[PDB]
Symmetry: D2
Subunit: 304 residues, 4 copies
Amino acid sequence: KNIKMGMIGLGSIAQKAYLPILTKSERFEFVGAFTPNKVKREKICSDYRIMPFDSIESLAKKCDCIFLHSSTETHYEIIKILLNLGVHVYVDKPLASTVSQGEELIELSTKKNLNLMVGFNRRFCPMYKEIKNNATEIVSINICKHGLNSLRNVRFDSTLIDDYIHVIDTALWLANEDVEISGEDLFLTDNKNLIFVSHKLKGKNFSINTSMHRDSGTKLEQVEILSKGKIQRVKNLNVLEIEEGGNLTLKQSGAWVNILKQKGFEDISNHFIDCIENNIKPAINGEECIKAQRLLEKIINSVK
Amino acid sequence: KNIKMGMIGLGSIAQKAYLPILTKSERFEFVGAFTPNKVKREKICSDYRIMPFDSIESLAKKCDCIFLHSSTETHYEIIKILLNLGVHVYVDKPLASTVSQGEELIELSTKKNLNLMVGFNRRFCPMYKEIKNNATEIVSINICKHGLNSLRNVRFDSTLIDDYIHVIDTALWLANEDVEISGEDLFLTDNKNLIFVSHKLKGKNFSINTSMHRDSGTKLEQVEILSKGKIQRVKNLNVLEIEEGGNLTLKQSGAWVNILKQKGFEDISNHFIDCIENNIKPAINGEECIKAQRLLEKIINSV
Amino acid sequence: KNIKMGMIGLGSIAQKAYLPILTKSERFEFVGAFTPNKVKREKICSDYRIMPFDSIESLAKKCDCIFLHSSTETHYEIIKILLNLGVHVYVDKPLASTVSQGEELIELSTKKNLNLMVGFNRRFCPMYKEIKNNATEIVSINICKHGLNSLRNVRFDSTLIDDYIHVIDTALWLANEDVEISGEDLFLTDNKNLIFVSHKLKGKNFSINTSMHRDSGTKLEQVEILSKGKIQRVKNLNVLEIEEGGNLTLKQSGAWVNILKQKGFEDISNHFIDCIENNIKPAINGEECIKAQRLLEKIINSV
Amino acid sequence: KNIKMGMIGLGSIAQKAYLPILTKSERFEFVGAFTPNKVKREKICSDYRIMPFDSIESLAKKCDCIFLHSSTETHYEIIKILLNLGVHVYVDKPLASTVSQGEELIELSTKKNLNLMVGFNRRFCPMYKEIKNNATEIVSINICKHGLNSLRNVRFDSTLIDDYIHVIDTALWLANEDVEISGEDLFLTDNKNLIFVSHKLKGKNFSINTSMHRDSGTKLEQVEILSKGKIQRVKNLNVLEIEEGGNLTLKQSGAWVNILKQKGFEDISNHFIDCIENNIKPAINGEECIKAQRLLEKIINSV
Ligand SMILES: [Cl-]
Ligand SMILES: [Cl-]
Ligand SMILES: [Cl-]
Ligand SMILES: [Cl-]
Ligand SMILES: [Cl-]
Ligand SMILES: [Cl-]
Ligand SMILES: [Cl-]
Ligand SMILES: [Cl-]
Ligand SMILES: [Cl-]
Ligand SMILES: [Cl-]
Ligand SMILES: [Cl-]
Ligand SMILES: [Cl-]
Ligand SMILES: [Cl-]
């Protein structure tokens, strides 16, 4: 086929969120894959009948684009190599360890006329798109993402950039207007691990209330939009509730809608490829790749 | 019995929230009732076999205490008459139209050694008390009270002290620590009617996010408490949800639990009577009667 | 007032399901009440400012109608006394200990030109009426009534005619067509206490599956109607669910709808009085009073 | 690897329910696939980097086992060919168009020492297994499978064998004791298409109520087990509800549990392979492959 794709990084995220969709290779040729651990590389590639490659460079030279699912700290150096070898790059969030590094990569991509897209899957979550499209005259939005036994020994800034970024990015995508921080809770363990974080993001027309508790009673995600005559909620990316006219209407995801379709991974990955096919840029480009991260760096830097 | 009770105001609130409880008069004598419309007064009194009285003063002279369910604007003048006649008073929120008037009434009640209690029923809502009792190491609380087609043709300030006051009072009762306003949204119609209001009330240990949308998709009230290892929610004062260990547990109010018991009206009314019997003040006394309203006046003054 | 009403039997059901309605005596004069236990009689009457009476007969002579809430075995001779004294009678289910005794009472009421009504409140449950009214082209109905720790040390037949009768009556009311019983499950303890009962009631156009588990994991009731393009459910008489077009829509009872209104007690009691006022027979009259009981007698006799 | 697997039939079921799991070929070599339409064959094989084969026979000769996802009417002829070529066979339900044919195929598999397994995935549904394993002293089971706009332009017997068979198979698996039909509803269109079917299956200890409405308000599947002190329900194979001690606990499938794991397809497919690896017959073999179909044939013949 026209488009040749490779994958770099065959870790748990690649295995559960990307491989299951991309290995049904309908709109591209799956040229090969690389991961540093040779044993794991050969086993995964064998399972899917994909050609294993011995390096980032050898794979990139045979591809038009790469799905990169490596650790955040390796993004900057790997993406610089890939862009210089002329391949489009899809990478999991965040783009790079710092926004400054991200800005450098963005400029390199535009110089090379290549798409550098960050995997904010929630922007492609079908039910999130539905409530966004159907909301008019919004008065408030609430977004939360809580975890069960999710309290670990990593500094809070890592957790913010790695996970809270999804909450902030979804907020900014829904706001579709400039916002300012008007409230913050940030609770840390004695050893500086994240317990709870919350913000109020104020826009001209409404505010967004974002919240993440790492030591909650369940793993939950919810977006709730309050608008004229209506409440819309999407729970765990896959149940849609609408309160209107004094009734609560509940819609489930279809019985045969796979979980990657539900969460937006299917559509975001296919969109990345489609944009290459049609010589256009995905909406997640440029400042869109780093605006949530920029806000988080400001929050992180305000911590005395 | 030892305690003689009378009721002033026999309108919708009295009929739905108080009379269904107080007319089964187990702990007091229901001496009589008054409301200005004579036909309505005699009809409601006849319905319940209660003696109708022709004035506030005539009724008060025969009672030890009065349940007052009149319009907010009439609270100040009526309560002054009642306290000066030596009767304890229970009144629906808010105490009076202004905090100043409330302060005056509180002072008068202290001078006369009488109980003046404001009807913040949510502090006696059984499920609210349950979640408050069982939460430890709280990180956040969210409280909302939304309405369907509930835009009112009155200035926003009236709607805040009449209705949002429940949200604010419940927040302060749950906080059990000082709080500061750290965020606000106040959206009004062109005629200055309330559409939406929200605040963040920040305490040292956690914050409370409050909200009220008057033009929502349903009538709903919810308190949600996020604490270490747990989420607790009470919906419409009568369904309790707990999320713990990755599962959700749902408890309904018992099949024969009456709605006034569910909402706290039964317990708050009984508590008022019990405090008279025991010669003590209810917890909703003094500054507790007006602390939520004080916060609302700061909001109103800022517009 | 034109209509004089009295109440006989002031037990737990009278206290929770009838007195809270009837003591707001809008459409009738509450003349008095009698119950065999004098101490209880006087306490309850004092609480509601009702006149206590010394006997069934002394009360009946001062009334046009009586709400009777006595034990099933006492219904027959009491009702005979009341109808012979010219009083309309509302009674809790079942009418009498046996269907042939009920048939006699019905004929006596006819001879005396009086109404004799049995308290099948579910026929007046607002949400049950709503789903009945909106269902067309029904293919199946499921009705269940389960209890938590509801095993009682009484013979199964008593539980069937005192509680399962509500399930059967609701089924027959929803069927509105002849049905034939089949597919019986009847599980009893060694001591012959009811554990579980179920039936399939087959009509020409659809069947109704009825069940009742007395040692379940919760107290619940549900009516579910499957029809063309639709599922309707009412849970615990107060939540209405509709599945149509691939969506579930849930409607709760209004925030101020009292539980007796929810369950049909309010409307059934008011219906009894209205029918007296307008000189007509209530919905539940004649064979409607005993049709469910007749089916249960056939069931009990087949064991 | 040791086990060589091929797939015959690359239609909608293969694509949604099998290929997504089997193409991650961890425990076998995916040797190739065949489907009659060459264009579709080459597209799907290209998508997954699998070798396309031009016939059933050429593929079978290179495999140890075959997953067969062809139309019911072709099962008998294809399965005879495969068993005679020495390949183990996994096929979607039902085994063949008739029980006579199925019995022949089973006997043929025994003669050739090969496994012939029918794809009753619900027996491997994790939540179904959980409730089955946790139920004791069952008093009743209800199973339904309803559809939205699911009326099919085929005779009812086809729909019973193709779809209601899941309901009946799950019932017999949960019963684990002999049952007798104690009730039946069967409603058809003028052209003899299935609208609604229901049965009561009576066992010594409890009954199972099965139903399927093809013109309902939503697509729904539910298994509910009533037992001593407990109600357990599994909805759409992926939400578990337990009612116990008067409260309802709800457990969702894990956020990263894929839908084929949820529905039992993953586990049934892996079990088929594991049994080949261990020289054992899988759970669903012999009479288990046709037990549900046998009951349906009796139902169909009784019409
Ligand atoms: Cl690796
Ligand atoms: Cl689907
Ligand atoms: Cl976008
Ligand atoms: Cl008045
Ligand atoms: Cl109760
Ligand atoms: Cl009530
Ligand atoms: Cl008594
Ligand atoms: Cl209401
Ligand atoms: Cl009727
Ligand atoms: Cl084909
Ligand atoms: Cl279980
Ligand atoms: Cl998971
Ligand atoms: Cl999936």
